[PDB]
Amino acid sequence: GCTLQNLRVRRDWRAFSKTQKKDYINSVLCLQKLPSRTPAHLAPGARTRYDDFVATHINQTQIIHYTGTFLAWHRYFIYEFEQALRDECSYTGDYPYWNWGADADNMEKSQVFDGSETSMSGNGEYIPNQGDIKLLLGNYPAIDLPPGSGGGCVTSGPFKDYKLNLGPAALSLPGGNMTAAANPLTYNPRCMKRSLTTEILQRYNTFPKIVELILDSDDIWDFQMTMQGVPGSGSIGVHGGGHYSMGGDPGRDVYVSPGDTAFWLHHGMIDRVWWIWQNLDLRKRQNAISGTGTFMNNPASPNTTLDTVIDLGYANGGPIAMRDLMSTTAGPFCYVYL
Amino acid sequence: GCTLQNLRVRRDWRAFSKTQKKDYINSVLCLQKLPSRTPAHLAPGARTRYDDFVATHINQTQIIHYTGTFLAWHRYFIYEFEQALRDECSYTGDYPYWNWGADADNMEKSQVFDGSETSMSGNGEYIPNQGDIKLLLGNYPAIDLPPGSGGGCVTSGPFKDYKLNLGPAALSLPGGNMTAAANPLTYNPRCMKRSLTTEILQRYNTFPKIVELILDSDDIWDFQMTMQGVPGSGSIGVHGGGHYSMGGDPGRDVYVSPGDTAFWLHHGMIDRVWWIWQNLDLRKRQNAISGTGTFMNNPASPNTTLDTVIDLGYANGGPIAMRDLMSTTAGPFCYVYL
Numbered sequence: 001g002c003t004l005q006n007l008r009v010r011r012d013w014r015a016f017s018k019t020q021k022k023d024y025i026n027s028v029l030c031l032q033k034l035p036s037r038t039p040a041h042l043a044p045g046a047r048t049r050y051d052d053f054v055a056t057h058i059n060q061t062q063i064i065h066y067t068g069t070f071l072a073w074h075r076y077f078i079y080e081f082e083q084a085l086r087d088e089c090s091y092t093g094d095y096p097y098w099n100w101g102a103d104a105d106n107m108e109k110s111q112v113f114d115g116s117e118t119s120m121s122g123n124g125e126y127i128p129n130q131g132d133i134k135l136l137l138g139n140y141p142a143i144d145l146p147p148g149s150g151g152g153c154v155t156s157g158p159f160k161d162y163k164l165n166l167g168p169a170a171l172s173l174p175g176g177n178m179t180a181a182a183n184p185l186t187y188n189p190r191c192m193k194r195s196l197t198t199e200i201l202q203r204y205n206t207f208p209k210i211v212e213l214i215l216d217s218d219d220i221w222d223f224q225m226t227m228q229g230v231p232g233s234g235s236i237g238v239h240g241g242g243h244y245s246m247g248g249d250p251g252r253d254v255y256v257s258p259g260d261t262a263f264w265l266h267h268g269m270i271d272r273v274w275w276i277w278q279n280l281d282l283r284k285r286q287n288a289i290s291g292t293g294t295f296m297n298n299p300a301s302p303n304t305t306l307d308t309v310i311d312l313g314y315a316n317g318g319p320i321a322m323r324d325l326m327s328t329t330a331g332p333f334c335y336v337y338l
Numbered sequence: 339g340c341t342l343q344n345l346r347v348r349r350d351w352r353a354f355s356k357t358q359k360k361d362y363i364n365s366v367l368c369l370q371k372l373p374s375r376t377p378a379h380l381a382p383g384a385r386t387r388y389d390d391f392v393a394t395h396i397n398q399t400q401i402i403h404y405t406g407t408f409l410a411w412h413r414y415f416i417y418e419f420e421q422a423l424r425d426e427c428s429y430t431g432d433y434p435y436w437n438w439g440a441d442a443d444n445m446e447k448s449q450v451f452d453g454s455e456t457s458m459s460g461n462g463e464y465i466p467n468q469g470d471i472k473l474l475l476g477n478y479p480a481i482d483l484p485p486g487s488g489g490g491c492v493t494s495g496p497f498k499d500y501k502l503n504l505g506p507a508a509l510s511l512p513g514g515n516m517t518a519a520a521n522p523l524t525y526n527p528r529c530m531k532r533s534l535t536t537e538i539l540q541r542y543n544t545f546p547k548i549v550e551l552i553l554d555s556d557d558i559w560d561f562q563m564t565m566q567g568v569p570g571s572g573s574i575g576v577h578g579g580g581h582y583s584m585g586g587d588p589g590r591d592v593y594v595s596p597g598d599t600a601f602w603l604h605h606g607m608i609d610r611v612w613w614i615w616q617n618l619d620l621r622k623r624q625n626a627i628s629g630t631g632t633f634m635n636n637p638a639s640p641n642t643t644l645d646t647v648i649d650l651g652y653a654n655g656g657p658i659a660m661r662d663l664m665s666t667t668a669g670p671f672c673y674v675y676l
């Protein structure tokens with residue numbers, strides 16, 4: 001199946017040429033023009049194929065974060081997105097990732113976020129005198145985060161005229177309040193907001209943090225909890241840092257986060273870090289799983305196993321077992337990271 | 339509104355005469371014959387009006403246990419179930435509650451579970467050598483519970499030929515495995531299983547335990563947590579105690595628990611205990627609320643407030659705000675407990 005001949009390579013965004021960057025960006029725009037597949041009565045707010053991906057994430061958020069299926073489900077998700085870009089948008093380039101480490105002293109100068117024509121758009125319109133973001137996970141003390149250097153709609157770049165249609169589902173706001181639609185799958189068109197927060201990166205996504213994550217995680221449990229943020233440490237891990245550092249809407253919504261176009265580059269890096277960690281010890285780590293099928297095991301559910309079946313709903317793909325997802329060179333996958 | 343004239347009393351099941359016990363039983367059996375309202379595409383496995391109540395519980399479980407609405411939602415839920423009994427089944431008697439304390443040395447002799455024609459059916463067919471029930475609440479060490487003196491389908495009484503149609507959703511088994519239907523709102527007819535476990539009552543629902551709950555809980559948070567089971571404490575509360583002591587299916591499934599006909603008596607007591615606790619200090623406790631709109635706040639959601647609206651779907655009644663649910667003698671309610 002996976003052979004040296006049909007091996008694809010996943011590459012840092014900093015390693016894409018100007019022409020390669022736009023090829024990718026244009027593909028994603030093409031996803032935002034194509035009509036949605038999700039049946040209107042299940043997600044009335046859906047319009048585009050991109051919406052289809054956003055909807056499944058909202059629909060499944062409760063069963064795909066702090067579960068045994070978190071890493072694998074996301075690996076599939078971004079895989080089937082890539083497959084959309086290829087099969088429907090005629091993309092023939094490589095899957096990009098966002099190397100957090102390289103932008104942690106100055107996020108506004110990040111090639112992902114410089115706001116130029118080769119970025120995923122940039123900062124939001126500056127809003128002064130904003131309160132702090134307070135994240136409560138469960139019932140531990142809230143983590144305190146700076147509001148960032150934007151806050152309003154994105155000012156420049158290829159996604160300035162991009163309409164976000166679904167959400168908000170649980171959007172953290174400056175000051176600590178939280179916006180939640182009666183149901184986030186209905187039509188609520190608005191612009192993508194961002195408030196770039198370099199400080200957040202300084203705390204959680206520096207190169208020391210990333211290496212620590214890889215080298216000090218003895219078991220999948222330790223790995224995936226350190227990545228997501230062990231509730232009660234005041235860490236939100238690399239995965240939280242990457243999300244909240246984008247600020248804005250839906251940067252700060254756990255459910256609607258794919259609504260931000262940097263999601264895919266963010267999760268490319270998640271997948272890369274995971275893949276790396278796995279490969280330090282394939283015999284024990286290749287197929288390791290820990291956790292249940294529910295967020296923090298609340299309500300309790302069965303332990304996830306290789307036999308556990310997961311899907312992307314109407315976004316793309318079909319039902320697929322976990323044993324088919326454990327390797328980037330097995331099942332439906334045949335790629336590495338450079 | 340509610341006056342001394344139209345006031346209703348809720349009574350201990352032990353205080354029902356043989357005829358009054360039968361009158362209630364026949365009303366519940368009548369709900370198990372009347373056709374459901376839930377539109378079939380939403381719950382394919384619902385057949386009866388009783389099922390409607392089960393289905394809504396399954397649907398909303400994620401947002402009614404360990405939330406700010408837990409107590410108020412259940413008080414409404416059981417009121418609306420009493421209303422179905424009056425309006426559709428001609429019941430004119432009182433709401434019954436199950437006093438856990440009075441049966442905590444020997445549950446098999448309980449007037450609720452004695453297997454007679456005046457009980458909610460009794461124990462299940464005996465199944466020897468069953469392993470221990472292991473409840474994993476969130477990510478804390480497992481709570482061991484004995485397997486009880488039953489296991490099979492109920493052997494006697496009004497509900498021996500009662501068909502349970504929905505679920506399982508997250509059914510804990512002896513040995514520590516858990517059965518979960520791919521989706522539990524589909525048609526899965528089967529008998530009600532029980533495995534009456536006195537020992538669980540001995541640990542969690544004694545008169546000392548119930549009095550501790552009321553007198554030692556200084557605020558609504560302390561109260562609702564102690565009642566449900568504070569996570570990590572190795573306690574499951576009176577709330578968990580009541581359910582798990584029934585054993586069987588769906589006694590051991592947090593989603594489907596209304597499928598067990600004792601659920602309503604159990605929750606009369608829960609409401610009684612809450613009412614009692616409110617009435618020790620009405621200035622502070624009448625409208626006291628704490629917690630969010632998600633199970634253990636996972637994922638994070640807004641704080642429940644008096645303006646938070648809840649519904650029981652197609653079971654009965656309409657949307658209603660929390661402020662209207664706080665008093666047994668205001669809003670739609672006019673009752674007390676003896």
Ligand SMILES: *[C@@H]1O[C@H](CO)[C@@H](O[C@@H]2O[C@H](CO)[C@@H](O)[C@H](O)[C@H]2NC(C)=O)[C@H](O)[C@H]1NC(C)=O
Nearest residue numbers: 038042043055056059060185313314521522523
């Ligand atoms: C949200 O997820 C639910 C499942 O949790 C999806 O509904 C299921 O879809 C399949 C269709 O193949 C049915 O056969 C199941 O019986 C459905 N289950 C339930 C509980 O409805 C639904 O597709 C998702 N909604 C969206 C918009 O993706």
Ligand SMILES: *[C@@H]1O[C@H](CO)[C@@H](O)[C@H](O)[C@H]1NC(C)=O
Nearest residue numbers: 176177178628629640641642
């Ligand atoms: C929610 O209530 C708690 C007190 O229980 C408090 O810490 C916090 O201010 C409230 N949260 C919001 C978002 O208002």
Ligand SMILES: *[C@@H]1O[C@H](CO)[C@@H](O)[C@H](O)[C@H]1NC(C)=O
Nearest residue numbers: 289290291292303513514515
């Ligand atoms: C379920 O798996 C968890 C780890 O995810 C483990 O602690 C527990 O012992 C397992 N139990 C069973 C019965 O599978």
Ligand SMILES: *[C@@H]1O[C@H](CO)[C@@H](O)[C@H](O)[C@H]1NC(C)=O
Nearest residue numbers: 376380381393394397651652
């Ligand atoms: C379940 O809850 C959803 C979310 O509000 C609702 O729209 C749907 O009607 C409910 N289904 C049933 C069977 O009550």
Ligand SMILES: [Cu+2]
Nearest residue numbers: 057064065074
């Ligand atoms: Cu996700």
Ligand SMILES: [Cu+2]
Nearest residue numbers: 239243257267
């Ligand atoms: Cu993410």
Ligand SMILES: [Cu+2]
Nearest residue numbers: 395402403412
């Ligand atoms: Cu309940």
Ligand SMILES: [Cu+2]
Nearest residue numbers: 577581595605
């Ligand atoms: Cu209950």
